[PDB]
Amino acid sequence: KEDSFCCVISMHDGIVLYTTPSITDVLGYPRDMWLGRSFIDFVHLKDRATFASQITTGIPIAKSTFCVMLRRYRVSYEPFRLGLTFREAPEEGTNMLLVICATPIKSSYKVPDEILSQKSPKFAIRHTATGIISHVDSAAVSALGYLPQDLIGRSIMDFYHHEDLSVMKETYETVMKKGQTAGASFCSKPYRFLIQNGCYVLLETEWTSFVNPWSRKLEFVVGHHRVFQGPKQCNVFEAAPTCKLKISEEAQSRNTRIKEDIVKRLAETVSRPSETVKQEVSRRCQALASFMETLMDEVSRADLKL
Amino acid sequence: KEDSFCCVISMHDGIVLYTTPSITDVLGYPRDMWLGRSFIDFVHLKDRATFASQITTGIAKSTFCVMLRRYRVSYEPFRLGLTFREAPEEARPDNYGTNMLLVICATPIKSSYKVPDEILSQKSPKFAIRHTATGIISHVDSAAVSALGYLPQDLIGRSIMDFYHHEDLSVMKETYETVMKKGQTAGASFCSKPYRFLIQNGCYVLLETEWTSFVNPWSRKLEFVVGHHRVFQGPKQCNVFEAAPTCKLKISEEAQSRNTRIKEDIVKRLAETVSRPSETVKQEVSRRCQALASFMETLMDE
């Protein structure tokens, strides 16, 4: 197992009816203090919209599992991986019941400036051509300290250390060149990334991308991350503990320009040249034709028939 | 089986590499006329953003509807089947990265009606449609394509209000007033009497609905309405896809206006916060510790 508590909400007024005893151990709340209270009253403001959008797109008219920050009793908020489950009323129109299973999320690091190996939490963050994070893997939470909803929406550029904007511009220029060939990937030298507590970590990234074959423009960039070196601060969830400052003029201005260029270049069209003419070695190759004839059936059957 | 063709696209340049011979009997295209060409060129304009988003978020497997042009121009609805398979690594002749292959099977969609003013049967189309508190259509079942003539994308994003016959806007209001009344009881439904619904071709059909909704229990606001429809009476024109020029009219002032003002009263009624009282209190919530704990026990061994 792992320290976790469940609670039972009423889909009529959103009040909490039952809380497992473990509630006092995991969050400090007295056995039956949650009783009768509104459940979202314990869900941090920044996460309610994520919560609302989850019980809206999940209601019955695994099962949904997302993250949120709950508050501790008698202030601080802590990260929880919640498991929603809708089931009909028991005991003695339909009365619905929501059962939530909150299990705490804890920081990936054991020592300051940890250098990781194979026990290393690998994870992917994906962003659009204009640099807006659209997806983040589960793993990313314990490693960076952000909840998926804390990153999605924001610009990936807000996380590259200011001194490193020029080195990132070259990594991104490399990503666009690699775009000439689909699936062409590449690992880059470890760079600093801003994590929840203001500290920076070194991330080793494998960069891949998707270019729309019809339009030839960049759809999204996805970095497969692994933390090369952890933060000075082990806890990745506490409030900003030191570490911040920069030279106004030549920085924010030079930096804002560099980002301007990266996004400029990412919008640029990629080359996918018409080499396919000599390629009538495969246009005439009996092997390829047979495979594709079959490929056409392995699919024509599967999807439309079942 | 059911009439259908399949093409194999290159994810590199987006051109089509292989085609089934049935392409000719389905779309009318000369067997290998499609080879070498860019696939979107055959996908209707209004369905390009749908086709783009689909391969993008997808790179059973993805399956959606799109309009494709025949060989002449007219277009026809098609249920596609996308499958991404890795292009068998070249024997060793050309490119030194991985090549991805897009396989697409297109089976033609046909109208759900054989004869005009089709009466209700077990064979009659049943499909649910969902719209937000403000009336924007957010979800439409696959069953509704052959029944109304609209492909999901032609419906998602529009106002549900744009489809009620102009003479029914007053009767639709009380129905909506009933949705909101029932919204006082979670999961309470009610069947409404048959009403007109505009279909792609301009004709109307009779839709008998069983209306249900979801009200956020924390905000006390209506979240969305879902209507389970059953086509009571079919369109005057069987083929719901080809726009038929036999249905029209206009009437401004006390119609265009008075009606457009009614839609608001309705959509303003949907904005009202619903009441969720409680003839239950304090210790009653703790009287159920044993009851709810046991419930949550069995919900655990699962």
Domain ranges of chain A: 1-105, 106-306
- B227 CB neighbours in chain A (<8 A) are none
Tokens of B166: 């102009």
Distance from CA of B218 to the nearest CA of A (A): 5
- Cα(B133)–Cα(B135) distance, integer angstroms: 6
Same fold, B1-109 and B110-302: yes
- Cα(B229)–Cα(B197) distance, integer angstroms: 11
- A62 CB neighbours in chain B (<8 A) are none
Minimal Cβ distance to B186: which of A93, A99, A220: A93
- Counted across chains A and B, CB pairs separated by less than 8 A come out at 164
Give the resolution in Å: 2.8
**Chain A contact for B83, CB < 8 A?**
yes
- Cα(B215)–Cα(B133) distance, integer angstroms: 9
The CATH code of the domain at B1-109 is 3.30.450.20
Separation in Å, CA B264 to CA B42, B133, B175, B251: 40, 12, 15, 19
> Is B79's CB within 8 Å of A274's CB?
no
What is the DSSP secondary-structure string of chain B?
----EEEEEETTT-BEEEE-TTHHHHH---TTSSTTSBGGGGB-GGGHHHHHHHHHHH------EEEEE-----EEEEEEEEEEEE-----SSS-----EEEEEEEEE---S-SSTTPBP-SSS-EEEEEEETT-BEEEE-GGGHHHHS--HHHHTTSBGGGGB-TTTHHHHHHHHHHHHHHTTSTT--EEPPPEEEE-TTS-EEEEEEEEEEEEETTTTEEEEEEEEEEEEE--SSS-SSS--TT-----TTTTHHHHHHHHHHHHHHSSSPPP---S--TTHHHHTHHHHHHHHHHTT--
Helix (H, G, I), strand (E, B) or coil at A92: coil
- Cα(B184)–Cα(A93) distance, integer angstroms: 10
Please give the CATH superfamily to which domain A106-306 belongs: PAS domain (3.30.450.20)
Tell me the Ramachandran region of residue A30: left when phi exceeds 0, alpha when psi lies from -120 to 50, beta otherwise. beta
> Is A303's CB within 8 Å of B11's CB?
no
- Cα(B187)–Cα(B64) distance, integer angstroms: 30
Distance from CA of B47 to the nearest CA of A (A): 14
**Within chain A, how many helices (H) and strands (E) appear?**
7, 10
Cβ neighbours, 10 Å, residue B170: 12
The top-level CATH class assigned to B110-302 is alpha beta
Q: Which of A4, A92, A304 to mutate to test the interface with B (most CBs of B within 10 A)?
A: A304
- Residues B43, B130: contact at Cβ < 8 Å? no
- Residues A123, A145: contact at Cβ < 8 Å? no
> Is A18's CB within 8 Å of B188's CB?
no
Which H/E stretch holds residue A88? strand A77-88
- Determination technique for this entry: X-ray
Length of chain A: 306
- Cα(A102)–Cα(A191) distance, integer angstroms: 34
Cβ neighbours, 10 Å, residue B161: 21
Distance from CA of B217 to the nearest CA of A (A): 5
Separation in Å, CA B165 to CA A270, B118, B162: 49, 19, 8
Q: Which of A41, A42, A56, A61 to mutate to test the interface with B (most CBs of B within 10 A)?
A: A61
Residue type, A257: R
Domain A1-105 has CATH 3.30.450.20: yes
What is the gyration radius of the CA atoms in chain B, in angstroms? 25
> Is A59's CB within 8 Å of B14's CB?
no
- Cα(A202)–Cα(A186) distance, integer angstroms: 17
Q: Which residue has the tokens 């299990």?
A: A103
- Residues A177, A262: contact at Cβ < 8 Å? no
- B83 CB neighbours in chain A (<8 A) are 299, 302-303
Tokens of B195: 């009403």
Interface of B with A in 181-210 (CB under 8 A): 185-188
Which residue on chain A is closest to B39 by alpha carbon? Answer: A214
Residue type, A250: E
